[PDB]
């Protein structure tokens, strides 16, 4: 980015202006996972983009996952799994490990990366200041709803206390664990938690970092790649999508139907994908709007 | 506490008044460890006492340890230790485990206990919002200062951001990990960190929960138990004390010399020891003042 | 309270916690009269309990009476009384004396007692900053409503200005005099004024200090002493109660029906009765709730 | 004021402008006593002028006396006086009467008069919120300093809490009683208290209402009437002035030497003397400045 | 105003009190034009009266015209006019001159005059901070509505930003130019703009300075001069009034019907007419109220 | 900017981050003149860049000139000039025209351009709220200091009121006219005024838009173009520079010596020069630092 003429650098920056205006002073919830979480270059760029948003007066809120790190630690601890369908059962023991890995390892890495740019990141779970609660969820397997232990969905969100934190200039980094109404902590799917946080905070956008170019309606036909789709059309397409994309699409559906103006499935394998999706018209991601 | 006449219950409460006046609106830093951390009755009472202080308009700040929980997890993970003197060397690997256990397990338990009473507790480390930094420390072994890895002392404290948190009505629960000036996270001894936080926050008291009645000057002579001692006298006595008491005494010395009006070594095996030490004249603990 | 074991002192304090949580940040209106007002030990303890509430972050508001002090001063001044039924007629002259005694003597004593603990108490009447107004009341005598001069009921309350005063950390001590809509100051019964202030301020509790154990439904049968009663049941019982208890019961009825969660008739002859009633389950008083 | 041409009414108002600019947002302490306190027309006009200042964004603070009302009440109560020199001895009994008359009668009348114009006036003594303290004073009689009981001078003033009250839009009406360092309430001379309040509050002016045209240097020579004098000249003249003027002059001296820009001795027998002195160049009063 | 006795000066000031109470803390919009704008004595007095209101805690907002100054500058620039009916057509060129004269000359003179008394005046147009917008208006000529270029009516007003300016202690001086919805700046009649600003700001009064004694219903019969009239009566009279008075009357109608409590047509040829109309009962102006 | 690969657009934006961090929450004063003021494309881009800074949480303050527009209007009005040396004498008449052109024409155009992006721009002069004052300046001609009328330098700046305006989210657009201590308005050179505003506001940068690539030390040698120079070196070079560059260089000297961290002479003929200079390392401008 050095031989590139200076009048072209100017145009690239100037074209950010309409999106800076759209997002100034607004909440943007970003689900962070996949290869954006595992490669040092993609990670460092993600943390820089969070600092970028913050130094534009945008209020990012990061919700992270960590499925494979949990599995890796359970295997290290010799904790034998129980599986119903394709789901590990989250016993009290598995929860303790999940919480310890998500909050004490995965979230720590991102907090420190972001904080290389300033005193921005702060880690939290639903446990802290009772910021949100969980309700136990069942899963459908072989056509029957089934209990797989201490896993849940976001129940209620302390919207005011959460926005107080971003008003202090902080970037919350959320590990998806929260107590139920009896104080018993559950693990929440990070994609669904991200949609719930976006709706509760009145976010202007929900970004979903995934390891794909975007939503293909007829995978693997390359021409089936769509760049914008409405919730009604997308809900009808949901039964036909691969297993990995369903939670990302359900998230976008719940968020946009919940009033979030747009949710985006963007390619987490692209360095600075957040900057590309937010401040550029050239993203490969797909945008979900209501309709 | 039922056959006890009602006019005696009244006198007990009324005698709390001078200490409520002393502490209203003031910061009290509490080092929490030992059996107060491991027994369910002592723990639940500790969490209730933190809620008590908060519902009196006192601002508690909890600094916790977790030495044995770390050791237990290292053994579970099969991480062979290296030892210089009696000190485990904190390699990058051992740090990751220490941080994950302290922040993702030990701190979580206390946060949830306290939060059974309200949205009070919030967990943090020096990493979050760069709340404090560490400087690597050496230890003296066989008369020579020696490096034992990523262990440090508190360097600087973001006093303003920390007090903003208690001003929100929060009870910080601090896990003693913090980055050095290069962003590399160190493990800090919880006793020393507690003294450093007390001094930086202008705390009115530092409480040190330990598993002993109090400071014995000539252990094990029962009559050597003292109830108040000045920093000058206590510094001269420090070379003669058992190994377990030195860090607790050094903490009290640094805090009180640092301007904290008093530091207290109190018996963490007594249910509601905090209430006893703060709102009663009948504590067995020992009080350190400057002189 | 010295030979009493330390673990019992701890339990007494710890059992205050649920009521500290209930009252933190809340308004508590206390009608103060009777022997609690005349004996030096009961008085000093009352003032200490007001300071106690204030140093817990509770907002006490004190409404005081002074019937007998007024009578005593009228006799000293040689002011001959006029009586309709059992009621002294409050001429302009009698009002001046009542106001001067209530505000310039009785209220002064309590303000100074409370202020021995800090800059808390502040005296006021409805006259000051037009904090409340009066409407002239008649009384029923021999079955006919009758004018007995410048006596009234609370008309309107400047809720906002009153709460601004407690927000400053002040403890208002209210002498029950207030202007009517024409600026003419009336004397208001202190029991009824206390209920009116409680309702207007959204108080969490109304305490009525009286010189009896509590409400007896069939005085003097000792077993008729009740510890909790609903407003509907109590309204039906009101025509059967002794003359001294009627104003205290009407007060509790108006307050609780007015939305105050509970009103309490407690024994003002018990040292620290406020502490006993608020922070203990062993009070002899009776609690009024809606039903 | 009806046949007077309209262009003359305009000029009178327009000439108020430089003094409105001088006083906007500033504290003005007014000592109120004499015939301005006893005649219904002068009183009602005084209260209106206090409302005038308040509705210009000026912050009046009223300090009142009441010597003769106290004497009258003592005689009504049959309280025999003890006299040293020309001074009544203020026994505990005489204090109670003084406080009750000053705060519960004299201050009440002014509060109600002012409040006919709005929720402005609020009565206070040094007792309330420990707004100020007293130190016992002796008097010189026949050349020897002598104790005459519970009479004092203002010791310390809670400047911040007092200015908080005027910031709320209130007009404090101060009765000059205050506790000493042991909580024992003393009666303070109202002229001296007014000067002390002016200095502590950083008042822009001190007004002293008296029943004379102004300072005569060689009473009763009519030409000895001066309209402005400096503190140095006036201090030298003080030993030669009549008994009634000394406290008013000592007050002006202490205030202006204390940094109050000017103190004024104005004729309280003139209806609306405050308006005349503050917003007009035609006052008969005398102005004291430093020099 | 020197031989006039001092007790008469006092009465004049004291009679201002009810209107100071009415206006304290309230917005007063003043249309300023005519001879009040062109004579140095009337101008300087107008600026002083704006400073007077400000130093009483009243919030004046000045809307100014400048018709003849515009004409004079157009003639100096040799800009030939086009006229439909009696209306100059406001071409883009004529607008530039109008804006430059109104904002860069006429408004500057008033700002500087007012600012001789303090940092009060601040000049603005609808362009600044998009404080208000315009909508293009047509005029009726020979019975047909006709376009006369870039002239409009106030469309929307940024009420909040405007009141923020007066809350800072500023006196806005408004030049009536504002952009339409496409950013194209229009010239707005100053009388109509003044009524629109008064209604949008919730003004307590609208003052209309004109070069006449007041509204004559049957000009030139001297007895037809009315001092107060309701909007319904005045609307019926509007078709019968001289050409110069129609815009002033339409303004008062729109304002008072828009909820402004009263609008006043006052004689701008009287020195200090504002002071006379606001703080005196002797104004020759006419008051419009709803009915 | 369309065929350019998306990973290059990302890198351009990401490289803005260190300068966004440097400028977030900081004041940047921009002198705007030259061709950046006269060409529609350069102007519209300048206004967009001001909106860009504002939507990043940067606080721009624009100081504008307008020399040639003034000359053009004087010629249109037939105002014959008087010239001493090469300086037009600013008579009272010439000032009125200068003020009317600068504030009522030139500043209006920029305000409206900026406001196409939001309610940002607000026009002001030193006259408004007495935001700054002028002191009359002389010029040196043929070796003698000479009066050329109502031209001056910035004297004092109301730093607090000016920063209150940018705190409201406003972008001040300053026309360089201000009253002297006697209220007489002077015209101030816009380059010098810009440096004075930067120093008084504690600006982080001063940008000087000019119609040259940057400072040439040995014009017209192309290799004499420097990209960074210290104040000491640059002061020594000042006597050797062309006439047009002297005011721009004196400005940078006064600002940087006045404590402004850096002042920049940048090429106003480059579209989006502000974006290029601030958020890019590829600017042709020259940076002045202290040394």
- The string of DSSP letters for F60-128 reads EEEEE--HHHHHHHHHHTT----EETTEE-B-HHHHHHHHHHIIIIIHHHHHHHHTTSSS-EEEE-TTG
Report the 10 Å Cβ neighbour count for F33. Answer: 23
Tell me the CA distances in angstroms from C235 to C2, C238, C285, F136, one per residue in order.
45, 5, 18, 85
Beta bridge partners, F186, equal F178
Nearest to C147 by CA among C155, C159, C137, C162: C137
- Nearest Cα residue in chain A from B116: A183
Q: E-F interface: how many C-beta pairs under 8 angstroms? A: 97
Q: How far apart are CA A276 and CA A266, in angstroms?
A: 9
Instruction: Check CB contact of F290 with chain E, cutoff 8 Å.
Output: no
Show binding-site residues of A. Answer: 66-67, 88, 187
Measured between CA atoms, the residue of chain C closest to residue B274 is C10
Q: What CA–CA distances, in Å, run from B48 to B273, C6, C23, C25?
A: 11, 18, 16, 18
Which of F4, F13, F117 comes nearest A279 by C-beta?
Answer: F13
Query: How big is the CA angle at D104 (ends D100 and D106), to the nearest 5 degrees?
Result: 105
Phi and psi (nearest 5°) for A79?
Answer: -80, 105
Which of E9, E49, E271 is closest, CB to CB, to D280? E9
Question: Under a CB-based contact definition with an 8 Å cutoff, are residues A207 and A274 in contact?
Answer: yes
A291 lies within 8 A of chain B by CB: no
Dist. CA A273–CA F267, nearest whole Å: 33
Residue F262 makes CB contacts below 8 A (sequence gap 6+) with: F205, F206, F256, F287, F288, F289
State the DSSP H helix or E strand holding residue A194, giving kind and residue range, or none if neither: helix A190-200
**Distance from C-alpha of D51 to C-alpha of D58, rounded to nearest angstrom:** 10
Distance (Å, whole) CA C99 – CA D204: 34
Taken in order B50, B54, B57, B63, is the CA torsion positive or negative?
A: positive
Min Cα separation E52/chain D (Å):
6
Which of B63, B68, B13 shows the shortest CA–CA distance to B263?
A: B63
The helix-helix angle for C190-200 and C246-257 (nearest 10°) equals 10
Determine the Cα–Cα distance for residues E50 and E59; give it in Å rounded to an integer.
9
Query: Which chains lie within 8 Å of chain E at 3 or more CB pairs, if any?
Result: D, F
Specify which residues B59 forms β-bridges with: B27
Count of Cβ atoms closer than 10 Å to residue F80 Cβ? 7
- Residue E77 touches chain D, beta carbons under 8 Å: no
DSSP F216: B
CA nearest to D264, candidates D227, D216, D238:
D227
Pairwise CA distance, residues C20 & B56, whole Å: 7
Distance separating alpha carbons of residues C267 and A36, to the nearest angstrom? 69
Is E67 known to sit in a ligand binding site?
Answer: yes
Q: Is B75 exposed, middle or buried (0-12, 13-18, 19+ CB in 10 A)?
A: exposed
Residues of chain C found within 8 Å of residue D101, distances taken between Cβ atoms: 100, 104
For D142: left if phi > 0, alpha if psi spans -120 to 50, otherwise beta; the answer is left
- For residue A140, list its beta bridge partners: A145
Residue E183 carries which DSSP code?
Answer: S
Burial of F156 (0-12, 13-18, 19+ CB in 10 A): middle
Three-class DSSP category at F4: coil
Resolution in Å equals 2.1
Beta pairing partners, D205: D28, D262
Is the CB of A233 inside 8 Å of chain F's CB atoms? no
Torsion angle of the four alpha carbons C281, C285, C287, C288, in this order, in degrees rounded to the nearest 10? 180
Does D16 lie at the interface with C, CB-CB under 8 angstroms? no
Say whether B14 and C51 touch across the interface (CB within 8 A): no
CB contact under 8 A, D116 and C164: no
Residues of D in contact with C100 (CB under 8 A): 100-101, 104-105, 108
Show me where the domains of chain E are located. 1-291
User: Which residues of chain B lie closer than 8 angstroms to C55, CB-CB?
Assistant: 17, 20-21, 24, 56-57
Q: How far apart are CA C66 and CA C148, in angstroms?
A: 18
Is C154 part of the contact surface with chain B (CB cutoff 8 Å)? Answer: no
List CB contacts (< 8 A) between C57 and chain B. Answer: 24, 55-57
**Of the candidates E100, E75, E106, which has an alpha carbon nearest to the alpha carbon of residue E88?**
E75
Q: Chain E partners of D55 at a C-beta cutoff of 8 Å?
A: 17, 20-21, 24, 56-57
Does residue C193 contact residue C176 with C-beta atoms inside 8 Å? yes
Residues 6+ apart with CB under 8 A from C123: C103, C107, C108, C111, C172, C173, C174, C175, D123, D124, D127, D128
Among A87, A112, A108, A110, smallest CA distance to A99 is for A108
Q: What is the DSSP string of A9-35?
A: HHHHHHTTHHHHHHHTT-EEEEEE-GG
Strands (E), A85-162: 87-88, 121-124, 132-136, 139-141, 144-146, 151-157
Contact C134, C126 (CB under 8 A): yes
CB proximity F94 to E under 8 Å: no
- Please give the DSSP secondary-structure letter assigned to residue E77: T
- The residue of D62, D99, D100 whose CB has the most chain C CBs within 10 angstroms, and thus the best one to mutate to test that interface, is D100
Q: Looking at the complex, report in whole angstroms how far the Cα of residue E197 sits from the nearest Cα belonging to chain D.
A: 25
Q: Which residues contact A98 (CB under 8 A, 6 or more apart)?
A: A70, A90, A177, A187
Which one-letter DSSP state was computed for residue C142? T
Q: Which residue of chain F comes nearest to A280, CA vs CA? A: F9
Contact (Cβ atoms closer than 8 angstroms) between residue F39 and residue F49? no
Task: Report the distance separating Cα D212 and Cα D228, nearest Å.
Answer: 15
Which residues of F are less than 8 Å from E115 in CB distance? 127, 129-130, 179, 183
Place of tokens 């001066």: D226
Question: Does a cis peptide bond (omega within 30 degrees of 0) precede residue E220?
Answer: yes
Residue-wise DSSP of E79-107? ----EETTEE-B-HHHHHHHHHHIIIIIH
Contact A52 F13 (CB under 8 A): yes
Would an 8 Å CB–CB cutoff place C135 in contact with chain B? Answer: no
| Nearest-10 crossing angle of helices C159-167, C190-200 | 80
Instruction: Look at residue F5 and give its three-state secondary structure.
Output: coil
Q: Which residues of E touch D56 (CB under 8 A)?
A: 20, 24, 55-57
Q: What is the nearest CA distance from D109 to chain C, expressed in angstroms?
A: 10
Residue from the list C103, C121, C122 with its beta carbon closest to the beta carbon of D103: C103
What are the DSSP calls for C6-63, one per residue?
HHHHHHHHHTTHHHHHHHTT-EEEEEE-GGGGTSHHHHHHHHHHHHHHHTTT-EEEEE
Structure tokens at B27: 């910061």
User: What's the distance, CA A267 to chain centroid?
Assistant: 12
């Amino acid at each position: 980015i050095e031989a590139l003429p200076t009048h072209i650098k100017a145009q690239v920056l100037a074209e950010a202006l309409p999106w800076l205006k759209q997002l100034h002073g607004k909440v943007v919830v970003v689900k962070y996972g996949g290869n954006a979480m595992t490669d040092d270059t993609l990670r460092r760029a993600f943390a820089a983009d969070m600092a970028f948003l913050r130094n534009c007066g945008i209020h990012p809120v990061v919700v992270h996952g960590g499925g494979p790190q949990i599995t890796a630690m359970l295997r290290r601890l010799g904790i034998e799994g129980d599986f119903k369908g394709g789901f590990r059962v989250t016993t009290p023991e598995v929860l303790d490990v999940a919480r310890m890995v998500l909050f004490g390892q995965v979230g720590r890495e991102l907090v420190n990366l972001i904080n290389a740019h300033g005193p921005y990141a702060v880690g939290i779970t639903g446990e802290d200041a009772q910021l949100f609660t969980a309700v136990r969820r069942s899963v459908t397997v072989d056509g029957v709803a089934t209990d797989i232990g201490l896993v849940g969905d976001v129940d209620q969100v302390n919207t005011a206390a959460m926005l107080d934190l971003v008003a202090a200039g902080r970037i919350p980094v959320v590990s998806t664990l929260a107590p139920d109404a009896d104080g018993v902590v559950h693990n929440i799917n990070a994609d669904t938690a991200a949609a719930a946080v976006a709706e509760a905070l009145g976010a202007e956008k929900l970004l979903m970092l995934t390891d794909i170019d975007g939503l293909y309606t007829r995978w693997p036909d390359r021409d089936s790649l769509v760049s914008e789709i409405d919730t009604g059309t997308l809900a009808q397409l949901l039964p036909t999508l691969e297993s990995g994309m369903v939670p990302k699409v359900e998230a976008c559906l719940r968020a946009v139907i919940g009033g979030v103006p747009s949710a985006h499935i963007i390619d987490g394998r692209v360095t600075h994908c957040v900057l590309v999706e937010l401040f550029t018209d050239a993203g490969t991601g797909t945008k979900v709007v209501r309709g």
